[PDB]
Design a protein around this ligand. Sequence first.
Ligand SMILES: Cc1cc2nc3c(=O)[nH]c(=O)nc-3n(C[C@H](O)[C@H](O)[C@H](O)COP(=O)(O)OP(=O)(O)OC[C@H]3O[C@@H](n4cnc5c(N)ncnc54)[C@H](O)[C@@H]3O)c2cc1C
Ligand SMILES: Cc1cc2nc3c(=O)[nH]c(=O)nc-3n(C[C@H](O)[C@H](O)[C@H](O)COP(=O)(O)OP(=O)(O)OC[C@H]3O[C@@H](n4cnc5c(N)ncnc54)[C@H](O)[C@@H]3O)c2cc1C
Ligand SMILES: Cc1cc2nc3c(=O)[nH]c(=O)nc-3n(C[C@H](O)[C@H](O)[C@H](O)COP(=O)(O)OP(=O)(O)OC[C@H]3O[C@@H](n4cnc5c(N)ncnc54)[C@H](O)[C@@H]3O)c2cc1C
Ligand SMILES: CC(=O)c1sc(CCOP(=O)(O)OP(=O)(O)O)c(C)[n+]1Cc1cnc(C)nc1N
Ligand SMILES: CC(=O)c1sc(CCOP(=O)(O)OP(=O)(O)O)c(C)[n+]1Cc1cnc(C)nc1N
Ligand SMILES: CC(=O)c1sc(CCOP(=O)(O)OP(=O)(O)O)c(C)[n+]1Cc1cnc(C)nc1N
Ligand SMILES: [Mg+2]
Ligand SMILES: [Mg+2]
Ligand SMILES: [Mg+2]
Lengths: 589, 589, 589
Amino acid sequence: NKINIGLAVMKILESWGADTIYGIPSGTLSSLMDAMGEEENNVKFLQVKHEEVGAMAAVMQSKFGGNLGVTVGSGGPGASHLINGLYDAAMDNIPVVAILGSRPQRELNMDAFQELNQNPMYDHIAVYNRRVAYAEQLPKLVDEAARMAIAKRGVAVLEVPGDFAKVEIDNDQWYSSANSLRKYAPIAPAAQDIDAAVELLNNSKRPVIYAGIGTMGHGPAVQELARKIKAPVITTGKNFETFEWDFEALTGSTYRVGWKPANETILEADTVLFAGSNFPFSEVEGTFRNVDNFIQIDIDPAMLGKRHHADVAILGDAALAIDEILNKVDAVEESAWWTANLKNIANWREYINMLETKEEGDLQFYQVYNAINNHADEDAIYSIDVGNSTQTSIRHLHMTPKNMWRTSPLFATMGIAIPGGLGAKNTYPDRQVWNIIGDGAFSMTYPDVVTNVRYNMPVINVVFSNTEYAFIKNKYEDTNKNLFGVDFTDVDYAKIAEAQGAKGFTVSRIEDMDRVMAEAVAANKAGHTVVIDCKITQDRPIPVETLKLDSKLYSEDEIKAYKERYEAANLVPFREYLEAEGLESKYIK
Amino acid sequence: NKINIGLAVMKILESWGADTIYGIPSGTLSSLMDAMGEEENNVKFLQVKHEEVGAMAAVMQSKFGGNLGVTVGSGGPGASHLINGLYDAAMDNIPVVAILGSRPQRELNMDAFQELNQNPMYDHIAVYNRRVAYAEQLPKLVDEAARMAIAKRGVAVLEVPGDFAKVEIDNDQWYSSANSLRKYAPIAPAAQDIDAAVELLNNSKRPVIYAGIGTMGHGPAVQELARKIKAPVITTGKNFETFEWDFEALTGSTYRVGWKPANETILEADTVLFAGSNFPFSEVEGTFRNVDNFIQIDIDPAMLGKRHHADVAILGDAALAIDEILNKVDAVEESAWWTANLKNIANWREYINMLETKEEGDLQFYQVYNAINNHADEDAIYSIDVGNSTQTSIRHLHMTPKNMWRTSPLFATMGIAIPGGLGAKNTYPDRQVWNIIGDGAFSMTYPDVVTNVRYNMPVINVVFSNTEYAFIKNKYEDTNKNLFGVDFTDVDYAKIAEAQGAKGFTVSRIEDMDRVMAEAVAANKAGHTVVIDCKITQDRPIPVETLKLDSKLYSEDEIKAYKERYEAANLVPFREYLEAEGLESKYIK
Amino acid sequence: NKINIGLAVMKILESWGADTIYGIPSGTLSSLMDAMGEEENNVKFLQVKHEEVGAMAAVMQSKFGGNLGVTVGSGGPGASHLINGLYDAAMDNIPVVAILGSRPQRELNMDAFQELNQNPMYDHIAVYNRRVAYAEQLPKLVDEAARMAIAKRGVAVLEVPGDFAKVEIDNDQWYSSANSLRKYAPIAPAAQDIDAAVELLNNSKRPVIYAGIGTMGHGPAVQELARKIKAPVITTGKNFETFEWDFEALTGSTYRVGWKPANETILEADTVLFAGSNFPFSEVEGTFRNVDNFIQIDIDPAMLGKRHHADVAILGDAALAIDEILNKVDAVEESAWWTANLKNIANWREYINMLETKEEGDLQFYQVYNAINNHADEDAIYSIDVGNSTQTSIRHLHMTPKNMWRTSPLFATMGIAIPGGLGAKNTYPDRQVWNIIGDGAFSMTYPDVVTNVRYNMPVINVVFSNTEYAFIKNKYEDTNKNLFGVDFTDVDYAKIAEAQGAKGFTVSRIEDMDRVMAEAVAANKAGHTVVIDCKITQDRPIPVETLKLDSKLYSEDEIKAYKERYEAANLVPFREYLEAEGLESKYIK
Ligand SMILES: Cc1cc2nc3c(=O)[nH]c(=O)nc-3n(C[C@H](O)[C@H](O)[C@H](O)COP(=O)(O)OP(=O)(O)OC[C@H]3O[C@@H](n4cnc5c(N)ncnc54)[C@H](O)[C@@H]3O)c2cc1C
Ligand SMILES: Cc1cc2nc3c(=O)[nH]c(=O)nc-3n(C[C@H](O)[C@H](O)[C@H](O)COP(=O)(O)OP(=O)(O)OC[C@H]3O[C@@H](n4cnc5c(N)ncnc54)[C@H](O)[C@@H]3O)c2cc1C
Ligand SMILES: Cc1cc2nc3c(=O)[nH]c(=O)nc-3n(C[C@H](O)[C@H](O)[C@H](O)COP(=O)(O)OP(=O)(O)OC[C@H]3O[C@@H](n4cnc5c(N)ncnc54)[C@H](O)[C@@H]3O)c2cc1C
Ligand SMILES: CC(=O)c1sc(CCOP(=O)(O)OP(=O)(O)O)c(C)[n+]1Cc1cnc(C)nc1N
Ligand SMILES: CC(=O)c1sc(CCOP(=O)(O)OP(=O)(O)O)c(C)[n+]1Cc1cnc(C)nc1N
Ligand SMILES: CC(=O)c1sc(CCOP(=O)(O)OP(=O)(O)O)c(C)[n+]1Cc1cnc(C)nc1N
Ligand SMILES: [Mg+2]
Ligand SMILES: [Mg+2]
Ligand SMILES: [Mg+2]
């Protein structure tokens, strides 16, 4: 007639679909874990080597479309180790339950061993943050923690004295509210707002669609609208998978982790259809400084008019809004604007393709991605870390909506890749998973490669060894009138992988890349976790946030040096393509 | 006539003796670092692979008697990575300056990239926590940060917008208050309080001295007092180096990370001289439940009467107090109490020595320490990690005041060892440094082994590979009516070390341990960082917090099993030694 | 071509409808206020005597259906004084912008006069909490503060260095996003969920509708449903105005601030239609312990299944849900259940009416309310303070949807009444406003009576002088086996009102109450603020949370004493009415 509180907690977690708990065992968590596996319960424990990797995996699990993740941290140091993963979830508004273990109740406030008040730890970023006051309410609080993490789209934190889960209660003294879980269906936009948008788009001479992840699942519709009104497409760094990598009108993304086309288009555009985005560089980089009209679509009222004055605001689902717009807007037969953009994009793709298809020489980022493109499954999942890998992956990977690409986009914590792969593979065990990592970030997390090995969750780690914290050093050449402290010694990551039970590869030449990738993938299909140590050059990826190509903006000397350093001799400034179509730059005089 | 704000900051840090900054480069920290090395400034940057290791090294640097440490974390993820190191410093009351990099001022509050309010992050544990409001006051705030960290004995945190250090100011618009640094000299205790202590000690039939780190530097005096009044000595887990490892009257420490003698003595004692300690298990483990009188010595008023009712309270330096007491107290010629304790200690040392000196078989903790004892320098420094290593090191290392032993004693974060070695070697470059680590903790920090290699700071890493998070699993056998999730796969750490430019060794047999240690030390003296992968058994160290040896407390079956499992056939319960001297247990009936 | 930042802020506030700022002038707020009134701006300043009254008025302004309120607090003490008002808004989820003045930027971090970090002050309860980093972004942050307070339904806090508002900017460097303000229209519920509800209601033998403020604006529909299926109605303490005070099937509210009928009905009910409520006593008072089925309607997913296991969960507007249910459910011709409830309600109304209509004697709460009922406008607004006034007002006021009743229901801060009247009168200048206050709460706020006088915002303060903190003392008789410290001396509040420029009245006899109220109202219509000092008895209002009337639950002695003390000789326990209709209590045996 009674049940162990720990088993009740597992039953509740199971009811909310939270069937995986990431973490490291602890005395302050013994009771909870001791209950795992009872009465046919299916909540599994995935042991990591560093609690931050567990927290990040639990979060990335949801990012990749998986179930609500749960992460545990032992009282004190275990709990504090969850921070980078929780801050990432908070900034990305991703649901995740964090359980902080604690000393038994009798020890609280006694200044005992590893005994402290952990309530302040995550109060600032959490949507729910409580210290269980007595054993009997633990089930209710775990249930609410799940409900709140999901409803508030954020981090739900519970501090749990270690002695509570051992307590027993009547089976009728607990319940799950998972059965009452309800979510709102996509909301249609106000016709009045769609019409105002249509009018502006019809009258615009240089329209451009800036699509954020709010357009996820509606890329075809966005591409259709783009072609109907001849409006080029700009995407955000988080939304590339939404488009066919080779879409004729895709200009890429603006600023640093972007493409040349996008950065030029935005400064020449008249009307922007800001769809489902909260682009953070908007104000500080003056992204929309030359735009005449601004139309925004978003399901969140707090975002309407946030990044720029909105001439038209549309509250509602991006899909529905795009569909309504597509159907009501006037078709455009030809546009000098569209034609110039297509050619500018084509020019950029020539540049990118020639870099990717070199046949011999010292290995660069480009050829590694080329190889990934020639060997990856069409529905491959990419877990991207922070640094040059982010910048290059969205330029050189050839994705489509069949893929998934995720990173730590806003908080931007390094080391998100390996955890990303764990959450992905846990969700899709038969799906090919890639972790694209810089050596600096890999260095903050490679001990967890063994986790994939131990749990038979085969992933392919691609490590870019340039022996520098490049993303910073590269920028140091600009912002810094010096440099200093951005390089380190190279280590044999392939050998480290072997020591961990993984399969390691080392490659440093372009002419060996295709074979190495072939062998790495074959190994992954043999059930092995792989680490490809790519010893690349220190060539800095082309900095499209500072395009030194237009002779009316930079000196010939500057242009020559820029072309030379970035192998961009054939890149043509957008103004040339505009003028060829009889148009004039609206800001370059 | 002007100076770069960044150079001013370095000059101020240099004036406070803070000549080393630990961290990882960042765009949000570029300005500050760019200034390092100018105008003959000698503030060096030590690059780590994970910011938590940098934060911990900066803290351990002071713990080991070094200069004020400085740690940097890039805005957001870099800063949050400092947490485990800062919480350790906070709980241990260790001075440390933490600089959090941040987006440029113009980006603050704009919800820009990696832009957030970091003030809440460490407000709870810091003694100083401010966000620089404008460039010109950065020097003043760094100066105050140093002054406050030192005066308040804690964490001083500054959030610094990345664009401030580039600003220039008049040389007369900044100054360091380091020249005004003043500290109080040891304060003599009130004679009235010393006399009350003396009277109690003179009249006590079973005195015992419980010495905490407040007695650091006065071990000889404590040993002299112990012999004068025939009072055995109990130490805290943090204070072993204060005594000669083989002192005839040293009973060790109480509770889990302790010895058998100490745990028995405390339950049989009448009067306790609690000198310079804030022992955290006092109340929750009922350490002093059978004590009749309690005398406390401490320089901190907040501690007087905290762990137990104090019959006599002495405010002042432990050295001075011990000296005053020693001189005024009556000499004791013989004591049945003393005699029984000495024999109980001798019995324990027989047990410990026989474990350490085995000649053949599967390697255990014991023989690794035996080897360390036979090959280490007499002034060696030991950086101890958290787990079975802590428990075993204080039982098997043969230290004296010439040594230094430090860990993460209260917050108890794993992974403190490697950082400890960095701070130690940075402070004493020609001194032998040992990092004693469990494989679980090593797994949270081994990527930083390369840091010692890269910076030519040779250390000896001793890794205990039992393929479990033993300290927890061991206790799981008691507290848990099950277990689960406490084991992992073994990895070749020696091979990982080689891949990092370090020298690796692997040992699994007792008969090879002496030679392996010899070769490891010789390598360390050759300037190499070493990793000794000790493949040990899963034998649980004897649990002295639950001594099942007295037939009046446990069944014969229990005693037999306990002796069998812990190879303690020859250990004799303290009550036998007491009775042999004509005394009776005061609680065992 | 340029504009003062302060004027820009006022223009933005005006665009969001925030035309009133409550507070007290300050050096740290001088710049902002100095700009009020410029270029035809219409943002007015309402000066209070205590900043907490200003914060509460700004909040109550929205509670009463007014515009977004703004409250200001001078750096340090002025800002901290806002706390009770902000916590009330936070717990009630009411939008409000709070501006904290601060020392000029140059003084920040200098430990200057009244200079401190106010970011921690309200971080825990705010939905937006930032310190303006530079003058130029102040406009953008005020605009976002308004947008966020509204979108997040909570407290938006901005700390503003006093020197920023003086700075000038280009008119094109600021904009308001108020034009993009959009809100979701009522969402229809899932038909599947409505049908499950209907089925349960059709099959229920004892249905009951528990309506919270989510049903606001749909009382007629709720009353119609109640009559159609013969389900009595229970309301929450915040939702009385939604029903006609004399609705035949209104049982009142459960627990302490409730009626006898409601408290009995809930323990005898089978199926509950929990509509638009988040009743806080649910679990701790076991409100639904005897209920068989539970159906919940709410627009917030986080609330579904929170207060009790939900057999049916309906996500969507309460109006739409009630309408769908009303139309699909089966009509019920007669019900023994309904009949018994109506008679129990009628019995309660006989009791209440006889108390209210006494003709002579010492004045009690009852006759004051009787008088208010006979003289108040039909659309009067009632601002209720915390204490016996809350308990009694919902029992003795005769409200309808034409009225508005508001208090501090969850955080429950005393002193909310006067601020409530200010916000109400500011919103509806020609509407009759009543402040019902206990003397204890009046004592925390009467200096602000002058505010109504000074700003010609005539209100009627009704003060219940029982010279005790009754709501507590009353309960002290139960929970406390003593009492102590709950009484104080009586003061002449009428005389205090006169000293403040208000009109004071004093009444202590039932036979004078009608005339006094008549004269008080006539004075209010003469444009004067009135204070009616009601010297009442210390008679404790009947405690319906402990009904000692059923002989099968209490001894005859207890019942006699209960009837005697609360003049309830004629109250009949519900079980009698149930049995008379051939039904049996489901829990009283
Ligand atoms: C090292 C690094 C460098 C980077 N560099 C760049 C860079 O140069 N350029 C760049 O663009 N990014 C860059 N990023 C990523 C960048 O920081 C942002 O995270 C990203 O651009 C935000 O993209 P977003 O607008 O698509 O989505 P979010 O910021 O997640 O916003 C999505 C919006 O969509 C709305 N929404 C959600 N669902 C719907 C729906 N159904 N209908 C309508 N609206 C909906 C939401 O309410 C929200 O407002 C970088 C990241 C890293 C780690
Ligand atoms: C995994 C793990 C297990 C552990 N297990 C144990 C265990 O079983 N048993 C155990 O004992 N410890 C154990 N520890 C260590 C333990 O948690 C405490 O940190 C330690 O015992 C505190 O020792 P202390 O009293 O010497 O010093 P502190 O707690 O640092 O207190 C020192 C006191 O000395 C005072 N003081 C300082 N200078 C002076 C002066 N000049 N004169 C006078 N007073 C002065 C201070 O004000 C303070 O009150 C463990 C640690 C870990 C990480
Ligand atoms: C001294 C004091 C004593 C008190 N004593 C009592 C007492 O004895 N009994 C009592 O009942 N109260 C009492 N109260 C008030 C009590 O504390 C609660 O604040 C009140 O009962 C909450 O009422 P509620 O459920 O209507 O609304 P709320 O708690 O405000 O919850 C309203 C719910 O409606 C939902 N909602 C909003 N709009 C819609 C919509 N359009 N459609 C559907 N759902 C919607 C919301 O999401 C929310 O879940 C007392 C207050 C004080 C100050
Ligand atoms: C964006 C940001 O803040 C970056 S990008 C970057 C370079 C990463 O180097 P890696 O070697 O992994 O990759 P590479 O650029 O390909 O060489 C650093 C150090 N940072 C700062 C930083 C520091 N520390 C942490 C934990 N997270 C971040 N994001
Ligand atoms: C004390 C405490 O909280 C311990 S002791 C311990 C076992 C350490 O295992 P390791 O393999 O390093 O050593 P071993 O015991 O010799 O096998 C754990 C997991 N914990 C919990 C824990 C978790 N995570 C972190 C960051 N710090 C701590 N202290
Ligand atoms: C509910 C709650 O917490 C109450 S009800 C109550 C009695 C109020 O006395 P008053 O004289 O105003 O009214 P009366 O009951 O009619 O005599 C007190 C002191 N409290 C505690 C309390 C204390 N202080 C403040 C600021 N707010 C509250 N709510
Ligand atoms: Mg790199
Ligand atoms: Mg281990
Ligand atoms: Mg009163």
